[PDB]
RNA sequence: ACCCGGUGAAAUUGAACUGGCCGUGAAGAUGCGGCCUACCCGUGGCAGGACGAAAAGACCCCGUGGAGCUUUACUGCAGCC
RNA sequence: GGAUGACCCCAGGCGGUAGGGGAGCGUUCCCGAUGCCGAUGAAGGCCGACCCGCGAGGGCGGCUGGAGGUAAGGGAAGUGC
RNA sequence: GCUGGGGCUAGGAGUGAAAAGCUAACCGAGCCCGGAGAUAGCUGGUUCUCCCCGAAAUGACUUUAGGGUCAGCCUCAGGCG
RNA sequence: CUGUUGGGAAGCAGCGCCAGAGAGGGUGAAAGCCCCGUAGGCGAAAGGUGGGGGGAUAGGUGAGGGUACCCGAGUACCCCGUGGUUCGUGGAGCCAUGGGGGAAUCUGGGCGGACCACCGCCUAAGGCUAAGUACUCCGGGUGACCGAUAGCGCACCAGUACCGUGAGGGAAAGGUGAAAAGAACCCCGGGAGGGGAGUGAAAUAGAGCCUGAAACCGUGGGCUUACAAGCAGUCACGGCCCCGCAGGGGUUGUGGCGUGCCUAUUGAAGCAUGAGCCGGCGACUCACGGUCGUGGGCGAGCUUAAGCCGUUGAGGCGGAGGCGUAGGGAAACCGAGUCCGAACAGGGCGCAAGCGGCCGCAAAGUCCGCGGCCGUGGACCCGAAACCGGGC
RNA sequence: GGGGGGAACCUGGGGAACUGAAACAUCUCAGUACCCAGAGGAGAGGAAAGAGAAAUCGACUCCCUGAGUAGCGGCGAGCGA
């Protein structure tokens, strides 16, 4: 049959235009109280994966 | 594939276009002796071809032909033979094929 | 050129990797699979993709991002497409949406946009809108852009 | 229903192949399920038997084995050739027999 | 039980041309080293060895294996209110 | 070298389990086959101290057998204990 | 009390002067057929030939620890040189 | 048709003919022309079918006005409990209904994802309806389907013998030859069996019957063996035996060397696993989907699916749709940029894309074939203890 | 007129567990296996109180595509118009 589209991946990934893939950094979902200023907002950025990883994610999108 | 089978053939001298046949009224020793006439007693294999019922009839039931309608025409029936004997509406047919 | 002549080109029909069959071959035995463990098994191994040990998985451990919407279905509405004027080149005269999905251009039930990227042609062309230097590149080099609905 | 034979007892034949190629007889018997016949004299071989009334102080008798149908052709009462048969009808219209080489009668 | 005539099984069995000592070796050797001893083949008897046979250890650990039981473990259901 | 792997000269590498890559042998079936071998003996079986191949093999000969077998080149697998 | 003949109660259920006993020669949950090729991070087993390279038994995380994911190490195809 | 070889022609030979038929199968071996057929045509008194054609009948068919009589009831609808849906209480509508409350009859009512407004779509609480679809007990056709450990469990008197109280389980077992010509009669024998004889092409085709392997048992022959120590072999020399004419083959006296195979392991000859021996079955696949590689086709393009037509081992059609040509951003939105931002800082993710004089050459991309892998299925094969269902 | 039978195929009323989630309870397996009723050569459905944004289509059934899209989901495993 088809495969299915892991949609937690979906909703958690992106595919770039050139293949990498891109996601949210993680830690200021809370715990926010205290962190820094500078680690508040380098938080915001998209970061891409390392590739191994990112690639496993890729297998996992068969149809974008 | 179509073209380059009959392409071939040809470019073997092994290919023959004609018009319609003479003394054939499905009643294959008339083919046969027609045939004779036309520059092949069947030492080598003949693919024919034309929308003609009568024509190929006559010129079924002999080993060394394989009948066909010309709608049919077919690569592998090509190489399979020795010898293309096609027709002219048979030829536009395949005309109408490669455009 | 008969049957006997027919032939694949070189490696175009290889023969297939054969395991199980005896030591020379290379892989008999074992049948490469090396020894035991979940990976040997008839049946996997699970998903290489995500399973990481029984570890919180290095994908769900990352956030989410946006809406991802919600019963009954998504909105319909307005969709668009990019084709610029690099493309059409290629043409001469006016040109209309439902001329240039036929062009292998646009994906039909989309509404054409124009964008520029490239050289303005003296040309008429409709689109359901241009992008602001589309529109700039194409009337200055004598054209005749038509916003249509 | 019925072994499309191509003979009748006791149509006149010509064992047209075997040890006797070229014997000529009469069909004495049939046997369709069998598919195979006797004809005067052809295919004879000896058989052993024992003392009994009937063959009393016997020892070996001969007997004449059948032939398979298809082995044996019938002879034309007129051109009196081999032949086969082809059937043909009167204005009757009954069904005959009728030699393929003359065209006449076979009875 | 043993000898003669009659009938004739079984588990088990890698293959055998299958000795002792002291060593050695996956740490208890007919099979490796060095000695020693020893003609070939049986019958009746004995049980020290072949880590003899039998039973994929029943004890112990392991398995995110099972089942019977228990309760103030969890969550449900019947039953009762 | 020469001239598009024809074959010769030279130097060098060539223990190998898990495992990766390569090049091959054979079995069943299909196109090649309306063909071709075959009772002056098919397949199968039993010999061989001969021939070719590094090898899996393939030839060739003798006995057995008594009605089948099937090439060059390709294709497909219920393909090798 | 023992006993023949005729009957009734069965599978989370019967029957039990209580042994988890008995319920058609193995009952802490009968037998048959089915779901069904259940699932087995475990044990076995895995079949022709010849050429080139050739490991690992470490690290991190792991209801993980004889299983795995990423990295380390082998190999094949392209590229740099 | 004839001749020839042969037990036997259908082989081989000479000379011919048919073909709307050279599919296939038989006949003593290999047959277009001997047999059954094949191509092409023909056929129903009776039964059945009859969707095509013919006929007949039920059946059907106007416009404006007025009135406001009718338009499916424990129903809508609202609330509580559920179910269905992609929708697992979710912003939770819709359709279905167990319990309560309960209407209206076109200025009626249900829906358009809470609800309200608007703007729409439809007429619930009566019923029937062909075709296109599913299946294969049956009958026909065809296999890059099996050939008696295979294919159905069953080619055979098999759901049998047998096993179980029962439900239930469930086998083995095909072949003489062309033709029974199935061995008269004779001799040893109680017979079984065999020896002559007799048939046959063949009788080591004799019914325990084609072929007739291997383990296994025997008779005969050559070498060898009773002072010898062994994973049974190997190397070397010598003897005797055979084939032959400086060469081989067989056997083994003496000497040298030498720890079975598999598996599992750090490590096994190992006193760790499995195997009495032979034979025959026995384990990496298939489909759909991914991702690479690869041989080809086309190239800012490539490609059809289901189906329609054609052929019955002929291919054509069909552009719906799919991937590709533009990205960035949660999104609106913008676009060679876009996002974050007040920024016209700076960053993140993008765009710059191959050689000559339009062509070529090559390809971005896509389609097909093949090969390696991955995901979904039992997914390399045998294996539980158990769980659940209906029955006995 | 009914009753009983019939390889599957169909509708209805009921309806699991192993398994998956590498444990498990919502979730999965799955409205699957299976019991029962019924109908038939098919069966069910079927002439909009439909669909859902086109000021659009116009009974039902079945096929391809839509699309593994929208969504559903201890937002997990997966499920899926
Ligand atoms: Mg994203
Ligand atoms: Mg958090
Ligand atoms: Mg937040
Ligand atoms: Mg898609
Ligand atoms: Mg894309
Ligand atoms: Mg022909
Ligand atoms: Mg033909
Ligand atoms: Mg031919
Ligand atoms: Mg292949
Ligand atoms: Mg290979
Ligand atoms: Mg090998
Ligand atoms: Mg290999
Ligand atoms: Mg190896
Ligand atoms: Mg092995
Ligand atoms: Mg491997
Ligand atoms: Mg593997
Ligand atoms: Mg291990
Ligand atoms: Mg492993
Ligand atoms: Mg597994
Ligand atoms: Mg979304
Ligand atoms: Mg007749
Ligand atoms: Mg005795
Ligand atoms: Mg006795
Ligand atoms: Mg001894
Ligand atoms: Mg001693
Ligand atoms: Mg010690
Ligand atoms: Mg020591
Ligand atoms: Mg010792
Ligand atoms: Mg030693
Ligand atoms: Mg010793
Ligand atoms: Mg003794
Ligand atoms: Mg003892
Ligand atoms: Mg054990
Ligand atoms: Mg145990
Ligand atoms: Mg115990
Ligand atoms: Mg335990
Ligand atoms: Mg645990
Ligand atoms: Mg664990
Ligand atoms: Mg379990
Ligand atoms: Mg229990
Ligand atoms: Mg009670
Ligand atoms: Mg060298
Ligand atoms: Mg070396
Ligand atoms: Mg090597
Ligand atoms: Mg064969
Ligand atoms: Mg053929
Ligand atoms: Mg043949
Ligand atoms: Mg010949
Ligand atoms: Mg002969
Ligand atoms: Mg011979
Ligand atoms: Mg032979
Ligand atoms: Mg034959
Ligand atoms: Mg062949
Ligand atoms: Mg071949
Ligand atoms: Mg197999
Ligand atoms: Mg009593
Ligand atoms: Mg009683
Ligand atoms: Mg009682
Ligand atoms: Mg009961
Ligand atoms: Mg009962
Ligand atoms: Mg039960
Ligand atoms: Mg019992
Ligand atoms: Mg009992
Ligand atoms: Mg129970
Ligand atoms: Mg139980
Ligand atoms: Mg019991
Ligand atoms: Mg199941
Ligand atoms: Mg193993
Ligand atoms: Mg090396
Ligand atoms: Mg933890
Ligand atoms: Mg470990
Ligand atoms: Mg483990
Ligand atoms: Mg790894
Ligand atoms: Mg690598
Ligand atoms: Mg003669
Ligand atoms: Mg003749
Ligand atoms: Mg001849
Ligand atoms: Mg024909
Ligand atoms: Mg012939
Ligand atoms: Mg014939
Ligand atoms: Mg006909
Ligand atoms: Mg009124
Ligand atoms: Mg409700
Ligand atoms: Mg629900
Ligand atoms: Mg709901
Ligand atoms: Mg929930
Ligand atoms: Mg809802
Ligand atoms: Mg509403
Ligand atoms: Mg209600
Ligand atoms: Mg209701
Ligand atoms: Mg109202
Ligand atoms: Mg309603
Ligand atoms: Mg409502
Ligand atoms: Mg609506
Ligand atoms: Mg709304
Ligand atoms: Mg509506
Ligand atoms: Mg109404
Ligand atoms: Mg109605
Ligand atoms: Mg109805
Ligand atoms: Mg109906
Ligand atoms: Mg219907
Ligand atoms: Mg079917
Ligand atoms: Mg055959
Ligand atoms: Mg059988
Ligand atoms: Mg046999
Ligand atoms: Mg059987
Ligand atoms: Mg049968
Ligand atoms: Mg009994
Ligand atoms: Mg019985
Ligand atoms: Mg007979
Ligand atoms: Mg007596
Ligand atoms: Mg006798
Ligand atoms: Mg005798
Ligand atoms: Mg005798
Ligand atoms: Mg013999
Ligand atoms: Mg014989
Ligand atoms: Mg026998
Ligand atoms: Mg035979
Ligand atoms: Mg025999
Ligand atoms: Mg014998
Ligand atoms: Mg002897
Ligand atoms: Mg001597
Ligand atoms: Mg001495
Ligand atoms: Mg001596
Ligand atoms: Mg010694
Ligand atoms: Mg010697
Ligand atoms: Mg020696
Ligand atoms: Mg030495
Ligand atoms: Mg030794
Ligand atoms: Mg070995
Ligand atoms: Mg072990
Ligand atoms: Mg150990
Ligand atoms: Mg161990
Ligand atoms: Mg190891
Ligand atoms: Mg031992
Ligand atoms: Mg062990
Ligand atoms: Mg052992
Ligand atoms: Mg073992
Ligand atoms: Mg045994
Ligand atoms: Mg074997
Ligand atoms: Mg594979
Ligand atoms: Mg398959
Ligand atoms: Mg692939
Ligand atoms: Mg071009
Ligand atoms: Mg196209
Ligand atoms: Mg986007
Ligand atoms: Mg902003
Ligand atoms: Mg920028
Ligand atoms: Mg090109
Ligand atoms: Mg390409
Ligand atoms: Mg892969
Ligand atoms: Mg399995
Ligand atoms: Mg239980
Ligand atoms: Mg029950
Ligand atoms: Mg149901
Ligand atoms: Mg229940
Ligand atoms: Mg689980
Ligand atoms: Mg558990
Ligand atoms: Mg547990
Ligand atoms: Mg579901
Ligand atoms: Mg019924
Ligand atoms: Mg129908
Ligand atoms: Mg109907
Ligand atoms: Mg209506
Ligand atoms: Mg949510
Ligand atoms: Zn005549």
Known sequence: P???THKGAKKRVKITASGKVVAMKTGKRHLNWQKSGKEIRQKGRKFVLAKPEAERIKLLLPYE | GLAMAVADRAREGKLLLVEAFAG???KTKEFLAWAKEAGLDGSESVL???GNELVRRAARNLPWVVTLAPEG??????????????DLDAWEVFQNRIG | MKLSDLRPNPGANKRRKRVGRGPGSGHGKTATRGHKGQKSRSGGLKDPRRFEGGRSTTLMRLPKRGMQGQVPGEIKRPRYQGVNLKDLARFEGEVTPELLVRAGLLKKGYRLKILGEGEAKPLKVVAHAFSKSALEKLKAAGGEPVLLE | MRVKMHVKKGDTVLVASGKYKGRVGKVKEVLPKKYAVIVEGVNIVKKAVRVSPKYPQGGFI??????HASKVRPICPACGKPTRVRKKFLENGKKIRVCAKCGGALD
Do not use: C, W
Not at chain 2, 73 to 86: A, K, Q
Not at chain 4, 62 to 67: G, H, N, R, S
């Open chain 1, 2 to 4: 088809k495969m299915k």
């Open chain 2, 24 to 26: 054939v009224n499905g």
């Open chain 2, 48 to 50: 024919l071809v034309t």
């Open chain 2, 73 to 86: 025409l077919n690569v592998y029936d090509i190489v399979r033979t020795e010898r293309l004997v096609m």
């Open chain 4, 62 to 67: 001969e007997k004449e084995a059948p032939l």
